[PDB]
Assembly symmetry: C3
Homo-oligomer: 285 residues x 3
């Protein structure tokens, strides 16, 4: 399961990073679908490959290590995670949790995250942005919650509440920014349900999930959100609707992931702009 | 993970405990929520710490380790489990199963369990008692059932049915005792769904669970109930509603009454 | 302890089997409920116990891989399955299906025992799977969790026509012309990891999820088959009628479940034989 995400190990990693950069991040960004360009446009960037950080978890896109990117975005100090640890890859709870807990010790106060999701809600269109206002953590309700195991008291409490998990003030700001900039029609809010994956959802599964009250379904994000809330980081999360879920078996349409990647690539410019304009107006500073 | 909960290992733990006490328990009790007294009220008590028993699972520090308390309660021999093993802590199936199977070998015929739960059913109020009449074992449906692995045939069958899992006669008696003693207005019956935890449930999760047909939600109890039924122990289980679930994102006290209820139920239990 | 179901290891197993038999199978059959007597019908056959195939998983007498001819077609039959409720790993379940693929299997046919949730179902009915709900898979116990084995398939497999519509059609037509079309339905199968039978509250929930039958197997093998491009036909025998009411004295009994399966075994075998008979030949 790699190194335990305890205070000792997390501090060690944080200190290693702090020798490599003088940027003290206020906002952490986990790049998902549509955020590829935002990562590139970080100003005065310093790129730290995961390979160069002892005990930091290792992931690659066909050979190329992920990176931590420090710098600024709209005048605000950020750290960007370029490369994530999805549970369908077989990563441990400790692997997924360590980077978020490292962000806490580095100074991160807000986490912004995107992902690719299937649209269950029948009003959604391809390319829509669905701000998460709540979630259903199917793995968590089973016995695959990321927090299962000894609680690391240094970071949070044994039984965390998830009441305002998707900060209502950050959601209101994100909607306002979209509306002010002429793409409010693309922005929805909804409930995201996690399918552990990596299979796309069958029509019967989608029909069930829609009837549970779910608006979008995806295979990521909730584990990161749980760790973030556990250690008191405010969360803003957006699903890009990269496929419209098929609810009937009598239908030749299907999710193919390349069209999922195409939707991400085509909405990247707008999602970058949105996130930059949100960051510009975030409170505290 | 510690030691396999097979008939040989369970036999050895049971034999060791039988040297430390002459009490042959007829009723096993696991108090979760309202565990104030009961263990206080047992006459002629014998407190056996978990560390005193070899191969018996041990709690993780906390400044207060587990005990197995033997004695009598309202004229019946009992064994109380103080110190539980919950799956959200990372305990293995064998760790949770072994204690219940030890109870079986010691002579336990009835298991009484209390726990703390979130109220999903909209007519519940904080402090209410909800007798479990059925459950939904979400971890079990999802391939984290406590019985996964080789079946221990000496305890039970490969594919146990869970018909009358929460004995209907015990529930009827429990309801009779509550109404007889003036706190019948607190008592409900319902379906308990297990959230593996340890996070509390989001509004959207609570809404989904309510619409699945669940009345309360908690992070324990079902694994123990499944092991109990597998080896033929009758089960009585009750949730104390300690949090009322919020359904949309837009939006100690009963300790003495619960221990008293359990004491009065045991008084009225049939005896062979 | 189990060997990874990667192309290197699967090749080694398939190459060992290919020295023990000349039969190149194009249909793979996994014997579940109602298919106990299927191995008997296989002609020009060779029985290979799992015990004499290195790194092939071991299940219990040992399980066998039977090669031969059924209704004129080359088949491999798995007598002995690896149920997840027994504690078997994903690799253990996946390897046999991937071996089938390297051996040449194009169609996988499978039966299982299931509880009938749909209130119109009768005991002994056949429910062809047209779709499924993989509760373990949704909850992070999907058989494909781990590094994707690219030799076999893609990272994010779609499950759109998982239960091949042409095979389902043919199966329904074969039943109808042989006079048992009234026993045949099509439905959604939900997986309960098991090994407990379902409580009344669980059954009620599953029925309201849109499920017709519930069982403890099959989906993991189906996912692996679809991942490597094998077409799938699957049928649940309704071996118990699910009890939705806690006050009812009715309950699932495993001896009655096995008895129901055995009673239908001749008919289920004949059905499978006649499906294979009518499959398009190239």
């Amino acid at each position: 399961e790699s190194v335990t995400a305890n205070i000792e190990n997390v501090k060690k990693v944080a200190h290693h990073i702090q020798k490599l950069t003088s940027i003290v991040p206020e906002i952490g960004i986990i790049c998902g679908s549509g955020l590829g360009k935002l990562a590139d446009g970080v100003k005065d960037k310093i790129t730290i490959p995961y390979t160069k950080i002892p005990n930091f978890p290792q992931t690659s896109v066909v050979g190329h290590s992920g990176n931590l990117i420090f710098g600024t975005l709209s005048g605000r100090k950020v750290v960007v995670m370029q490369g994530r640890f999805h549970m369908y890859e077989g990563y441990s709870n400790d692997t997924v949790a360590l980077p978020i807990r490292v962000m806490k010790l580095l100074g991160v106060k807000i986490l912004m995250v995107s992902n690719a999701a299937g649209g269950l809600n029948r009003s959604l269109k391809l390319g829509d942005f669905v701000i998460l206002k709540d979630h259903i953590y199917l793995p968590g309700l089973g016995l695959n919650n990321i927090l299962v195991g000894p609680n690391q008291e240094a970071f949070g409490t044994r039984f965390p509440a998830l009441s305002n998990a998707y900060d209502r003030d950050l959601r209101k700001l994100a909607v306002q920014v979209a509306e002010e900039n002429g793409f409010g029609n693309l922005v929805h809010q909804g409930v995201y349900v996690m399918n552990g994956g990596p299979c796309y959802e069958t029509p019967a599964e989608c029909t069930m999930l829609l009837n549970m009250g779910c608006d979008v379904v995806g295979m990521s994000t909730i584990p990161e959100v749980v760790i973030a809330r556990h250690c008191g980081i405010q969360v803003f999360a957006v699903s890009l609707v990269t496929n419209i879920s098929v609810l009937d078996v009598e239908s030749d349409l299907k999710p193919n992931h390349e069209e999922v990647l195409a939707t991400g690539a085509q909405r990247a410019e707008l999602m970058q702009s949105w996130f930059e304009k949100i960051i510009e107006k975030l409170p505290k500073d």
